Structure formats: structure tokens, C-alpha cells
Design a protein around this ligand. Structure first.
Ligand SMILES: [Mg+2]
Ligand SMILES: [Mg+2]
Ligand SMILES: [Mg+2]
Ligand SMILES: [Mg+2]
Ligand SMILES: [Mg+2]
Ligand SMILES: [Mg+2]
Ligand SMILES: [Mg+2]
Ligand SMILES: [Mg+2]
Ligand SMILES: [Mg+2]
Ligand SMILES: [Mg+2]
Ligand SMILES: [Mg+2]
Ligand SMILES: [Mg+2]
Ligand SMILES: [Mg+2]
Ligand SMILES: [Mg+2]
Ligand SMILES: [Mg+2]
Ligand SMILES: [Mg+2]
Ligand SMILES: [Mg+2]
Ligand SMILES: [Mg+2]
Ligand SMILES: [Zn+2]
Lengths: 251, 56, 22, 233
RNA sequence: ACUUAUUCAAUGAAGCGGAGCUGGAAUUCAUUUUCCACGUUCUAGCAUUCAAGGUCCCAUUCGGGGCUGAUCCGGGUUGAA
RNA sequence: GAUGGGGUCUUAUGGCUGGAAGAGGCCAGCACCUUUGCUGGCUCCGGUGCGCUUGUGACGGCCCGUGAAAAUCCACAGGA
RNA sequence: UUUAUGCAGGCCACCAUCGAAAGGGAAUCCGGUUAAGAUUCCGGAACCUGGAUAUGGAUUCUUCACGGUAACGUAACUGAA
């Protein structure tokens, strides 16, 4: 049999992300000294659109404390941030929409976004459009905060981790039907070559495990073991259950 | 074109103000106003925060 | 330009003062 | 005086550009600096077996000064004085046919590792100096036990370079006085009476003690903070 | 449990740890146990010339240098594991 | 802070002049193995447009699409 | 100013290179001319870059220009990191 499509995706020849029209990686400011001992003030110069991303970006300008210059960080714009707004980032920063307080210094129920997993990775969590992380509680001893992620999972991260206060802008995007293969084409044209998708059951058995037969049918069960190997993982990988999700998932 | 600016004199490239060929006149005006006004505000903040804890 | 221009300016001024030194 | 004013800059967190401070604590040094520092860090973070740190108790600077002052009187002859010596001996065997014995008997410090080890085995050494900074330490870890066994007195001293300048080399790593003159044999005796008390008589107790196991500054402050945390009573 | 092996991440390896000043609370049961701080938040401005000032030297002059301004100590870059 | 009254500016573009009529074009006449010329004139004034092509300007529509980078050049702040 | 370019200093931290005869990009047009070349040759008229430089003009004893309420104007009318 051939090497199947999802197996070919990892070589990254024509499956790399199209990154010509992107403004840069949207990361938080580095946790140098001011952010962990006080605050620092920057200004939102412009809120721009990023290609291949549903959320708008914000170009915040800070002053370098050690050299006479201006640093320009790219934040993911939270809902309500405007141009000319002063962003305050630090431990002593006030709890307002757009500020980058550490998670140890926010009360319970605070809605944050672009959250660090470990302090210093400059934003990993809740970066898609309309997403946010809730703070469930604190642990002063064993300095950790418990948070609820957009997936419903509950993580326990350091209280020195940072997060932008508010909700990621661009929310409610997927509530609109695309209506058109053209619109889906133009959406994926700036993300990566992952569209259109041929069903494996409509291929030949040299091309897919599901291929072949005088009727289009999968044959064996489509639930695949986690301990399967590459070339076999075509279907529902390690499905605990399957079929229509009735009732609450007991989260 | 940007290379042609090397051939003309300073009159064609500027006006006779601070931030002459760089900023708009109204932008220069509003930043002057902002500077003066909030430096006065910084002065009055200085004296009130001094005198409160000087009394206490 | 402006850098080679400034350097040409300083070269001309240095040559003028060096020839008027005598 | 009325033309000058006191600005003073607020060097707060967001206020003004910080001045140039001594950032020597945060210098990204080259790897050779980092390795040559972290090696001596690791050599005390570990519990060293007592055969090592049977070194590390070196000679104090006063006794080291007087023993080097003694050893400098018995210095090996340099090339120029050796050359005029052998020309003198050639002239002496020409005129008198002396059996290469017109030159007197030498009194010089014996050096070289195999040489002094054989001297110790033959019990000809009167005093041994062992350098402490030998980079393969296994070149000299056996020397104190051998000196204790043969009964010859030894002293672990700071500076193979110092011994090298003593014997007109760069380094020497060991030195030995095997035979001294009568003018300062008493000085040798009063010196060795303290050297043996510092090393030989303390040998059977330094043989049992494991050195090293010394924590850093931050970890030491952390453990003693935990100590005065547990000291509630 | 520890950290030094190993492993992870960032930085143009810039502010780590300890102690100390100066304030607030603090009850002191003798004298201080501690704990919090220890220059910035109406505003799309500005912030750079080993920093002005103060102080001490030089050989005054054209200026120059030191300390302080900007607390000491440890040279473990900082965390995680 | 409209309309209105008076001004300022970008010079794409267009107009006048120079370039430049001496050029080029259209004619006439005189000529001669011939290189072949030589000598005269005139080259002016307008009009129109849902026209074609092209450039540009001010706008408007579309996007879960918002539609390169660097070299390079200039200006400003500063006050050595 | 034995003098070469070290020593006097001071600034600076990108960090090879290749990659477009349709992307970006300093500056040229007309007339004529050959069997066959031309925005390249001839004639005329320009422009850019780099380098040398002198004169005139401008500015200054209120040293580094004036005018306009202003938008701004002019032949110029110091400006390093
Ligand atoms: Mg495709
Ligand atoms: Mg399909
Ligand atoms: Mg088929
Ligand atoms: Mg198969
Ligand atoms: Mg099939
Ligand atoms: Mg079929
Ligand atoms: Mg102008
Ligand atoms: Mg660092
Ligand atoms: Mg009006
Ligand atoms: Mg034009
Ligand atoms: Mg066309
Ligand atoms: Mg190239
Ligand atoms: Mg090209
Ligand atoms: Mg091109
Ligand atoms: Mg282009
Ligand atoms: Mg041709
Ligand atoms: Mg020509
Ligand atoms: Mg003038
Ligand atoms: Zn403007």
C-alpha cells in the first residue's frame, strides 16, 4: 500500500502553514523585572487583522527600561480594547480589561485570556476567538491557581503565570455558516493545505484502510486503538464511546 | 520618490515648525497641550500627595 | 546618503582647514 | 550656583531609563569559564572520600614562608652556573687529574615525582612537600600514605607553581629535602616538629572524614530558614 | 526530602537570595516578636549624552578624577523538574 | 463648529515660454553625366462626446479572504 | 605629527551567502544616419551618482535667517551619538 495522506502530512512539504501575511507570533511581554515587582505601561497603537487567525491583534508599545528605545509587543486583542488605550502589565497592575496581571493577584471568577502555562512562555492558553479561562480558586500555600479551560478541563498552574484580563475578541465567528466551498477555500488558503478532504472510503485500498469494495463501506470497526501505528490511525483514535452524544457528558 | 528627496532642498521637505515634515499641525498642537496640561497635573499631584502625608 | 554626505562634508572641511593652516 | 538645578531622576520601575550598573553577576561567560567554575562547585557538592580532602588542609602561610625560605638555600644549579662549574672541573682534571671531585658535594632539593617516590621508598627523604593543585590528583593521592608508612614527614603545600619557581621550572608538583647541612638542621627539626603535628599525627583522623557536601548560598539560606521554621517552641 | 548528575524553557543571561535602612499595622510584658510595604494609573505628549545636584582631591583653564545620588554581602543568569 | 466670506497646500495633470524651428512635414521654382543639390513659401485657428483605449482621483461594495519583504532615500526629536 | 597608525577615547550588537532579465530599483529625450546597429552611433538639448573644489549669493557684533493671526512661504538660512 501507499503512504496515506495523514501519514504524508508530517513531512511538511506542501502541508506547512502559509505564513507570508502574518504580523508575527502574538506573544506576551517578557517577565523581566517590572512585571514581577511592579507594573509597566504601554499603549495600544493599532488593532490590526491577522491572516489565518480569527482574533484581531493589538500592537502595544512599551518603553525599554534599560535602553532609550521603544519595544513593540503583539498581543491578542481582548474584547473592548481600543486604540490609544493604556495597557498596564505587572504584579501591581490594576484589574482592568487588557491588563496582564499575574494569576496570583486576581480574585476568583476573574475572566482572563492568553494565559501562560509556566511563567515565561508568553501566552499559551485561551488564544482563539471568543475563548477565555476562568479562575476557580487559589492555593497560597503551594502557590498554584486552579483554572477552568475552554474545554471544561481543570488545570493547576503557577500563581506567577500571567494572563490578559477579558475575552479574546472576534467571538461568535463560527456561528455564521460559510455557505460556500469558496469561503472555506479562502479560509484555508491562508492557514494550510488541508482542504478539500477526500473520504477514505471513496479511495482505493492502496490509498486508505477504508478504501475498496464493491460498495463504499469501512469494513472493520472505525475505532482504532491508541497503540496502533502510523498508517492504521485512520478513523476514531482511542474512542471511549461513539455515536450521538445524548445527555450530559459527566464532565 | 524617496531617492529624489536627496536632490531637493530643505524647503521642499519641511515646514518651519517643530515636527515640521514629520507630524501634522493639529497633532503638534494637541501634543503640546497634553504635555503642558499633564505636567501641571503632575505638579499638583506632587504637592497634594506630599501635604497629606506631611500632615499625617 | 546623509552618511557619505556627512563624511564628504567633514572631508571638505578638513581639507579646507588643512590647506589654510600652512 | 544660581544657574544649576537639582533634577534628580526617578529611577523607579516605569519612571526613567536605568543607569549603567555593575552587571558582573549576570555576565554570560564563555564555556571555559563556566566549566572551570562549575567543576570546583561540583567538587564540593559531592561527599569526597577522605583520601581527597586529606588534601585541602594546607600549610599555613607563616610556616610556608619559613619553609620556602629554608628550601631556597638549597636550590638546584642553573644552566650558567652548571656550565662554569663543569669548565672548572675540566680545568681541574686537566691540571690535577682529580676524579671529578674538585667540585664539592652538592646540597640541592630533590624533585621529580618518580625520583622522590624512590627516595621515600629508600627512606632517604628528610622532608617532603606535596603540591595541592595537581590536576590528576591520583598522581599524589598515594604520597601521604606512603610517607606515613615509610615514616618520612610530609606537608601538603599550596602551589606547584611555587615549587616550580623553587626548582627553576614552571611546576614541580613535589619537592623533597633528603640531606641538609649542619647550619640549619635544627631549623629543619623545629619545622618538622610542627609539620608532622599538622599532617602525620592527624592522618589517622583525616582518613575517616568525608569532605565536601557543602550547599550553595541560596540553598544554605533555604535550609536554615527551614531550621528556624522548625525551631518554634 | 535535598541538589550537583540528567531533563525542560527564556533572556542582548538586568535586578536572584540573604541581611539592613525608612514608613504602616503590631503586643510589646522589657525591648521589641513579627507581618506588610520599601518613587510610576483621569489624558494616543516627553523621557538617551559615564546624570543634574552635593561632597572630596588635582593644580585650574580649556577642565579631569573619586564617592554619593542609586544600602551592603554572596559572583548560583533566572525559573521548573 | 456647518453653510457662507477670505486664504493655505500637494503639482497627478493641463496652459504659456524656453528646448524649437534652425528640426520634421507639405508644396513651388531653378537646375544637371555628375558629389547632385540650390532658392523660395506654408506648417494656422477651432468644436464636440454615456465614444474607444489608457492613466489617475474622490468614493462606494465584498471577505471566518482585509489583500509581500528587504535594500534604499528623506524628515523630525535631541543638543555633542 | 621618531610615525605609522598604534596608543587617547567614544558608539554599535545585526550576526555568512545565494535566490526575480515580469517584484523593488538613481539618472535621456528629439531629429538624422547603415546593405545589415541604435533610447547605444552623429548633431543638439538634458539628467543622476561619486569625487574634488573656488567664486558669487545667503547668514553673523542679538553668532547658527526672516515673513505670515494661522494653515504655511522662500534661493540659501550649522546640527554628532
Ligand atoms: Mg488543498
Ligand atoms: Mg469529503
Ligand atoms: Mg474508485
Ligand atoms: Mg492496507
Ligand atoms: Mg472498503
Ligand atoms: Mg465502486
Ligand atoms: Mg516645505
Ligand atoms: Mg536572564
Ligand atoms: Mg467651512
Ligand atoms: Mg509632471
Ligand atoms: Mg488592458
Ligand atoms: Mg542577490
Ligand atoms: Mg530586477
Ligand atoms: Mg523590475
Ligand atoms: Mg510589489
Ligand atoms: Mg533593426
Ligand atoms: Mg550623443
Ligand atoms: Mg533670507
Ligand atoms: Zn497629524
Amino acid at each position: 500500500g501507499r503512504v496515506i495522506r495523514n501519514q504524508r502530512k508530517g513531512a511538511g512539504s506542501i502541508f506547512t502553514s502559509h505564513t507570508r501575511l502574518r504580523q508575527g507570533a502574538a506573544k506576551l511581554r517578557t517577565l523581566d523585572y517590572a512585571e514581577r515587582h511592579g507594573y509597566i505601561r504601554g499603549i495600544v497603537k493599532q488593532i490590526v487583522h491577522d491572516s489565518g487567525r480569527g482574533a484581531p491583534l493589538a500592537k502595544v508599545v512599551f518603553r525599554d527600561p534599560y535602553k532609550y528605545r521603544l519595544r513593540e509587543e503583539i498581543f491578542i486583542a481582548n474584547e473592548g480594547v481600543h486604540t490609544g488605550q493604556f495597557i498596564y502589565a505587572g504584579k501591581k497592575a490594576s484589574l482592568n480589561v487588557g491588563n496582564v496581571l499575574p494569576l496570583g493577584s486576581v480574585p476568583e471568577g476573574t475572566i482572563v485570556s492568553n494565559v501562560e502555562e509556566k511563567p515565561g512562555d508568553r501566552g499559551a492558553l485561551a488564544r482563539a476567538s471568543g475563548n477565555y479561562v476562568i479562575i476557580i480558586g487559589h492555593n497560597p500555600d503551594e502557590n498554584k491557581t486552579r483554572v477552568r479551560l475552554p474545554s471544561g478541563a481543570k488545570k493547576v498552574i503557577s500563581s506567577d503565570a500571567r494572563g490578559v484580563i477579558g475575552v479574546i475578541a472576534g467571538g461568535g465567528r463560527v456561528d455564521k455558516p460559510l455557505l460556500k466551498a469558496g469561503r472555506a477555500f479562502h479560509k484555508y488558503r491562508l492557514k494550510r493545505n488541508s482542504w478539500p478532504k477526500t473520504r477514505g472510503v471513496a479511495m482505493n485500498p492502496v490509498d486508505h484502510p477504508h478504501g475498496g469494495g464493491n460498495h463504499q463501506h469501512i469494513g472493520k470497526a472505525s475505532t482504532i486503538s491508541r497503540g496502533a501505528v502510523s498508517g492504521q490511525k485512520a478513523g476514531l483514535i482511542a474512542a471511549r464511546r461513539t455515536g450521538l452524544l445524548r445527555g450530559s457528558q459527566k464532565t | 520618490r524617496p531617492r529624489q528627496y536627496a536632490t531637493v532642498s530643505k524647503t521642499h521637505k519641511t515646514v518651519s515648525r517643530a515636527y515640521g515634515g514629520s507630524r501634522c499641525a493639529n497633532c503638534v498642537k494637541e501634543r503640546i497641550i497634553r504635555a503642558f496640561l499633564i505636567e501641571e497635573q503632575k505638579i499638583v499631584k506632587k504637592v497634594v500627595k506630599e501635604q497629606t502625608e506631611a500632615a499625617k | 546618503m546623509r552618511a557619505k554626505w556627512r563624511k564628504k562634508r567633514t572631508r571638505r572641511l578638513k581639507r579646507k582647514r588643512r590647506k589654510v593652516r600652512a | 550656583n544660581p544657574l544649576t538645578h537639582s533634577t534628580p531622576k526617578n529611577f523607579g520601575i516605569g519612571q526613567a531609563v536605568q543607569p549603567k550598573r555593575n552587571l558582573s553577576r549576570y555576565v554570560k561567560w564563555p564555556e571555559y569559564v563556566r566549566v572551570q567554575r562549575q567543576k570546583k562547585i561540583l567538587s564540593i557538592r559531592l561527599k569526597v572520600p577522605p583520601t581527597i580532602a586529606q588534601f585541602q588542609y594546607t600549610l599555613d602561610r607563616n610556616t610556608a614562608a619559613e619553609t620556602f625560605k629554608l628550601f631556597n638555600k638549597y636550590r638546584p644549579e642553573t644552566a650558567a652556573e652548571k656550565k662554569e662549574r663543569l669548565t672548572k672541573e675540566a680545568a681541574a682534571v686537566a691540571e690535577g687529574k682529580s676524579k671529578q671531585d674538585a667540585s664539592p658535594k652538592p646540597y640541592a632539593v630533590k624533585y621529580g615525582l618518580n625520583h622522590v617516590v624512590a627516595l621515600i621508598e629508600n627512606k632517604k627523604a628528610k622532608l617532603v612537600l606535596i603540591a595541592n593543585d595537581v590536576d590528576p590528583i591520583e598522581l599524589v593521592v598515594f604520597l601521604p600514605a606512603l610517607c606515613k608508612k615509610m615514616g618520612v614527614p610530609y606537608a601538603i603545600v599550596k602551589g606547584k607553581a611555587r615549587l616550580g619557581t623553587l626548582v627553576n621550572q614552571k611546576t614541580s608538583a613535589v619537592a623533597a629535602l633528603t640531606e641538609v647541612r649542619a647550619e640549619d638542621e635544627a631549623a629543619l627539626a623545629k619545622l618538622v616538629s610542627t609539620i608532622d603535628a599538622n599532617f602525620a599525627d592527624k592522618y589517622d583522623e583525616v582518613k575517616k572524614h568525608w569532605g565536601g557536601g557543602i550547599l550553595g548560598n541560596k540553598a544554605q539560606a533555604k535550609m536554615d530558614k527551614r531550621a528556624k521554621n522548625s525551631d518554634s517552641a
